[PDB]
């Protein structure tokens, strides 16, 4: 008879401490709430979306407000390569004199934190010049967050609560998301670029006062309607252009060089604007695809049902019934949509990480090395999170949303029909990568230890080097399709080539790095990590409904502890084991690739690339020249002789070690030991004098099995990101700082 | 240590409020919420 949790009455009559822990973790699982209909489910999700967008806009507003208020945006634009960006000030009652003296940095008179998110470069590139332009942006983002909050409150009122048919209107949502969310927003960003960012890069202040007066091109909107669009690409920016000022500046707003700015080592803003206008046109055209109200268009169900190879086709009826039963399976199940969304978002976040380091779009951000490291690692870890969550929600869809009657002999049913052929072949490719990657690493370790590094199996990655040469790199001498100037692709009308070729054949950027035998083995480690994490995830998603040891796995749901010690032992058999055991593999893979990125880029930025090129072929070079060598200035952030500016990073290093090792307690030690311990502690409380007056309302029990797997997983994860973020930031900030 | 930024006295008020005062308020209120019967 306890009012918490309100949404679950099974947990409300729980007399133990499991009620609070499970009311925290089942709060956002609206589908299992008591008295929940689909019509209320979709509206609560719709309002939670608005609350989350408001949280995003408030977080952005706080970031811009802390750049404006207690950061140094006036001083940084004068010398972006020397002045350290300030995130926010530090007010700590616990600082001694040493920490105040150490954290008084970046030209400040106060303890301040150095910004490593690199929003300073973003703001300088998009047109921010002074602190007032950041303050007005922060105030506008506050108004936008309040607007989203009022929209979310409004759509919970019964007058404005949308019907279920509005939420499942896929055709209109896709049209307005491609035409409006993707096309109109990219067109508007093109308008900002040609109206604010490109002229502010050329010294011309615009602001909100002069954008109706300053005309972006000398021929303003006259070549747009006549058709001679080349006028907007007649006078491009000179290679001697200096950013933020008028000398060397051009006049064209849509140039198409495809290279790098020689000063900022970034892509041209006119190139960015031209790219955004192109993709805005393509997104608007793609937004005019599905029929909504005016007859013309497409219906997704007809496209899916018409897509099945008939008889007489060389593949025949290999797909069975094809895709019929989809657009009901996908549209009815929110976990299918969520999994598809998370998979697409994880892939494009991986693309963001792989593209913002090799093709920087922000001014002077290629020469701020710690910003590049933080951005790449931050986006790749989030991409791993999104991808594991995509597969977890695929597992949730199979266990509680998959209907075999509706999906009868379609592609989705035939995935489950051979669901363990996939698992067996994915196990084979996981072992095929793992045995031989570890075999070559251990072989190289043993022969380097035995004084014979020439007995290493060094393999030149000739396929990826062929790809590099096909993209225009003449270093490997393949002479293939862009490396030679007499190819059919090189002799075309491709006018990106004069910029792209000397952008890719210059070693002063991160564009298409030199790869050797130390890049082959780490790439196969990466392939092993993705294949194995996919093996846990596919294995738990396809075995979510049930299998040979546990046929009725769908009756207990997605997340249950076990099915007892009977039938041989049944620990980690729920489809939640896929998520739980694949967080470890995802974190290991992201550790492998972020160690790869950090060590290769440390060799590049230091100017001594030979260290990675000879020591990454064996694991002791990884362990010594990357971990031990670059942890030196980290762990000396505070010593008996003083305090550096990296003392907070050494403290976070140790903090991440402590949380990561505390996770081992929940992951190795299991529940009944702790229940037996808490029973003795309960006896000691109830039998001592003067403390038995204080009685618990809920009976203290140990954390449940899934709860403790989750708690150890969260500790492992939080310790993992905290200690690697500390090591990364201090390692590449004690050198380049 | 007060900063050179505008309204430097606001970290001296908001940081102990968000770090000590309102977490005590939120834990007291959530304790009364999750432990009240009926």
């Amino acid at each position: 008879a306890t009012k918490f949790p309100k949404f679950s009455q099974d947990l409300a009559q729980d007399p133990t401490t499991r009620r609070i822990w499970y009311g925290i973790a089942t709060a956002h699982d609206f589908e299992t709430h008591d008295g929940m209909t689909e019509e209320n489910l979709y509206q609560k999700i719709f309002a939670s979306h608005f609350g989350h967008l408001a949280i995003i806009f408030l977080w952005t507003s706080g970031t811009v407000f802390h750049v404006a208020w207690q950061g140094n945006f006036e001083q940084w634009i004068k010398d972006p390569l020397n002045v350290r960006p300030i995130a926010h000030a530090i007010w700590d009652p616990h600082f001694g004199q040493g920490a105040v003296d150490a954290f008084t940095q970046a030209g400040a008179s106060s303890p301040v934190n150095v910004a490593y998110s690199g929003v300073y470069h973003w703001f300088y590139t998009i047109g921010m010049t002074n602190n007032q332009d950041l303050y007005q942006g922060a105030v506008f983002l506050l108004i936008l967050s309040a607007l989203f909050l009022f929209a979310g409150w409004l759509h919970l009122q019964p007058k404005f609560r949308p019907s279920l048919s509005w939420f499942k209107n896929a055709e209109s949502r896709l049209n307005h998301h491609l035409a409006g969310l993707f096309g109109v927003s990219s067109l508007a960003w093109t308008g900002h670029l040609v109206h604010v960012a490109i002229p502010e890069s050329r010294g011309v202040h615009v602001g909100w006062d002069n954008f109706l007066s300053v005309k972006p091109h000398p021929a303003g909107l006259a070549p747009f309607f006549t058709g001679n669009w080349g006028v907007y690409a007649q006078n491009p920016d000179t290679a001697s252009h200096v950013f933020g000022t008028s000398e060397g500046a051009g006049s064209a707003i849509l140039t198409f060089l495809g290279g790098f700015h020689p000063q900022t080592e970034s892509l041209w803003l006119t190139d960015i604007a031209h790219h955004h206008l192109a993709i805005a046109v393509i997104f608007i055209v793609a937004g005019h695809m599905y029929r909504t109200n005016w007859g013309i268009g497409h219906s997704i169900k007809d496209i899916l049902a018409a897509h099945n190879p008939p008889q007489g086709t060389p593949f025949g009826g290999a797909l069975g019934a094809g895709h019929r039963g989809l657009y009901d399976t996908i549209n009815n199940s929110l976990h299918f949509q969520l999994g598809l969304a998370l998979a697409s978002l994880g892939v494009i976040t991986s693309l963001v990480a792989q593209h913002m380091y090799s093709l920087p779009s922000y001014a002077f951000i290629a020469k701020d090395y710690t910003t590049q490291a933080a951005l790449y690692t931050h986006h790749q870890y989030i991409a791993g999170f999104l991808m594991v969550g995509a597969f977890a929600h695929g597992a949730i869809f199979f266990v509680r949303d998959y209907d075999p009657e509706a999906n009868k002999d379609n592609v989705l049913a035939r995935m489950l029909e051979h669901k363990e052929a996939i698992i067996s072949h994915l196990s084979w490719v996981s072992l095929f990568l793992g045995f031989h990657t570890l075999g070559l690493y251990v072989h190289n370790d043993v022969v380097v230890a035995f004084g014979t590094p020439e007995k290493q199996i060094l393999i030149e990655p000739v396929f990826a080097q062929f790809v590099q040469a096909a993209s225009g790199k003449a270093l490997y001498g393949f002479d293939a399709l862009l490396s030679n100037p007499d190819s059919v692709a090189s002799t075309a009308s491709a006018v990106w080539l004069p910029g792209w070729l000397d952008a890719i054949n210059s070693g002063t950027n991160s564009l298409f790095l030199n790869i050797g035998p130390g890049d082959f083995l780490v790439h196969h480690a990466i392939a092993l990590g993705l294949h194995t994490t996919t093996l846990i995830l596919v294995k738990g998603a396809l075995d979510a409904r049930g299998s040979k040891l546990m046929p009725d796995k769908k009756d207990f749901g997605f997340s249950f502890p076990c099915d007892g010690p009977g039938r041989g032992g049944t620990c980690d058999i729920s489809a939640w084991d896929a998520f739980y055991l694949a967080m470890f593999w995802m974190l290991n893979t992201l550790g492998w690739l972020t160690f790869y990125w950090h060590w290769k880029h440390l060799g590049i930025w230091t100017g001594n690339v030979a260290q990675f090129n000879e020591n990454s072929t064996y694991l002791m070079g990884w362990f010594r020249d990357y971990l031990w060598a670059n942890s030196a200035q980290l762990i000396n952030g505070y010593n008996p002789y003083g305090v550096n500016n990296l003392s907070v990073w050494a403290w976070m290093f140790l903090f991440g070690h402590l949380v990561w090792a505390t996770g081992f307690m929940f992951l190795i030690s299991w529940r009944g030991y702790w229940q037996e311990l808490i029973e003795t502690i309960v006896w000691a409380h109830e039998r001592t004098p003067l403390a038995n007056l204080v009685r618990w309302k809920d009976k203290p029990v140990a954390l449940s099995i899934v709860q403790a797997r989750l708690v150890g997983l969260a500790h492992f994860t939080v310790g993992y990101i905290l200690t690697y973020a500390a090591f990364l930031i201090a390692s590449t900030a004690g050198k380049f700082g | 240590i007060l900063g050179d930024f505008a309204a430097s006295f606001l970290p001296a008020i908001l940081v102990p409020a968000v770090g000590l005062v309102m977490p005590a308020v939120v834990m007291g209120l959530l304790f009364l919420q999750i432990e009240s019967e009926a």
Partner: peptide, 30 residues
């Protein structure tokens, strides 16, 4: 740099999402 009054202006502007977040959270509870 921004002025001292602009910080208090941004704070009382921030009370408008402060109130509306409290109004959305209670209606999301219902």
């Amino acid at each position: 740099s921004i002025s001292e009054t602009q910080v208090f202006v941004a704070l009382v502007i921030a009370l408008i999402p402060g109130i509306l977040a409290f109004r959305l959270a209670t209606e999301l509870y219902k």
